[PDB]
């Protein structure tokens, strides 16, 4: 595993480093619970520099993306507008989820996860070729996510005047280049904030300024508890190449209309949607204990027949004060289930696959 460029900054901030898909990354800086609290109530930040940023240019870029992705970038009509989308294989399974930004008719940007960098880049370069797209992997850039109710105001203390005017009152899911900073109102936590990409050689200093602006360093531990409360998927757990997006609470991201836009996996997905699929739900365990990944989830229908699903992600929610999980389960589950933890069947509530909105329990 590589030592990441912000390593001295992380260690000055008290990081406990762990191996994370080939990079030593902070698991936390002292207390993952404190770090979760900081993002819910003030401001926390995450080194997301091992996301890969991909710039796509050429007259056929929009057409290409309308084919590659299952959401529809035709919906991006204002400069800087972003959307979340799945990228599917021919059989309708999820290769990755990603964010894409529109800048001009012939300039878009994709951001992809570290774990799936190489698979996605290969998929992307294979399918872009016939469209004659200039494809730029921006490994020259680092990126920091600043999240929480005071994240934007704290970050914006570091912006010059041009930068503040460019993002003033910017709505969620926009990204804008302002000087050497690319500033986007995106995030993986359920809170307001930015993700800010900037040259590698500037990142350590910018992290330092952010700490000084009152933004708490936050590690992977907190990144998982915040994202899971917010009902946001993690590739490889909530979905993978064998799982349909309709079985991963990604139905809302499929842009079915207009009907004449074919995209990779659309045919398979149409079939899937007609057969019907399993569904991703929330689970809440108010009794003592922690739900864990891959545990069986069970329920008995009115007829007395048992059905089985599986936890895709489990954790302790600091905001709710109970364990929560996302779980993929047969259609027809009711309001409760049972999860096998050790050799005891723990009852759980079945809920929508989101636990927190606006720092409050979606109760």
């Amino acid at each position: 595993a590589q030592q990441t460029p912000l390593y001295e900054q992380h260690t000055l901030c008290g990081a406990r480093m762990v191996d994370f898909h080939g990079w030593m990354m902070p698991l936390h800086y002292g207390s993952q619970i404190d770090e979760h609290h900081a993002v819910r109530t003030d401001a926390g930040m995450f080194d997301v520099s091992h996301m890969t940023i991909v710039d796509l240019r050429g007259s056929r870029t929009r057409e290409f993306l309308r084919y590659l992705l299952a959401n529809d970038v035709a919906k991006l009509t204002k400069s800087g507008k972003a959307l979340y989308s799945g990228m599917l294989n021919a059989s309708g399974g999820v290769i990755d989820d990603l964010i894409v930004y529109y800048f001009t008719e012939d300039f878009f940007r994709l951001v992809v996860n570290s774990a799936t960098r190489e698979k996605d880049l290969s998929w992307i370069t294979q399918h872009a070729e016939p469209f004659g797209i200039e494809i730029t992997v921006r490994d020259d850039l680092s990126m920091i996510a600043v999240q929480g109710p005071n994240a934007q105001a704290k970050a914006a203390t570091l912006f010059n005047d041009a930068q503040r005017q460019a993002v003033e009152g910017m709505k969620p899911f926009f990204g804008v280049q302002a000087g050497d900073l690319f500033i986007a109102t995106t995030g993986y936590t359920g809170e307001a904030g930015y993700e800010i990409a900037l040259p590698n050689e500037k990142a350590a200093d910018f992290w330092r300024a952010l700490v000084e602006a009152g933004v708490k360093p936050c590690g992977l531990g907190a990144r998982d508890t915040l994202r899971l409360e917010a009902g946001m998927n993690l590739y490889g757990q909530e979905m993978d190449e064998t799982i349909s997006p309709l079985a991963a609470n990604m139905g809302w991201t499929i842009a079915w209309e207009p009907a004449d836009r074919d995209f990779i996996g659309r045919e398979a997905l149409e079939v899937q949607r007609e057969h019907g699929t399993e569904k991703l739900v929330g689970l809440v365990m108010t009794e003592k204990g922690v739900l864990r990944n891959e545990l069986p989830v069970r329920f008995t229908d009115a007829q007395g027949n048992q059905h089985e699903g599986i936890i895709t992600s489990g954790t302790f929610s600091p905001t709710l004060g109970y364990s929560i999980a996302l779980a993929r389960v047969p259609e027809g589950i009711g309001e409760t289930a049972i999860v096998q933890i050790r050799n005891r069947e723990m009852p759980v509530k079945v809920t929508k696959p989101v636990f927190v909105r606006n720092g409050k329990a979606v109760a």
Binding site: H28, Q32, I33, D34, G221, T225, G289, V290, F316
Partner: protein
């Protein structure tokens, strides 16, 4: 004082404080809490249980993992720390004070002399 001077210590990163009444107060060290991370639950033994050293007799649950806590010595449990039910984070914030896990009446004197003193434990961490 990541290692308080006057305590005894075990291999599995617990500490023991001999009390006025001859019993031992037991908890996990600063080192052990550091590696556990924030505690969200603790499962405690029954008051009155007899344990042998190395029995798994409590569980610390963090956001990441359950983690067994072992009896440092043989004896009978005479108390457990009920504050951990509402404040498990004390294991992290006060590992030598409010974060104590249980109290034990030791039943084997040669076990008690194998325990490390402050300096030996500081040395074990030095590896």
């Amino acid at each position: 004082s990541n290692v308080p001077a006057e305590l005894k210590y075990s291999k599995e990163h617990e500490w023991l404080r001999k009390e006025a009444d001859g019993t031992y107060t037991v908890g996990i060290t600063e080192h052990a809490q550091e590696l556990l991370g924030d505690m969200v639950f603790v499962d405690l033994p029954e008051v009155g249980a007899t344990v042998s050293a190395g029995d798994d007799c409590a569980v610390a649950e963090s956001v990441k993992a359950a983690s067994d806590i072992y009896a440092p010595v043989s004896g009978e449990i005479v108390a457990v720390n009920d504050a951990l039910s509402d404040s498990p984070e004390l294991v992290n914030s006060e590992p030598y004070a409010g974060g104590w896990i249980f109290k034990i009446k030791a039943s084997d004197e040669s076990e008690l002399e194998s325990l490390l003193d402050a300096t030996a434990y500081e040395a074990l961490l030095e590896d």
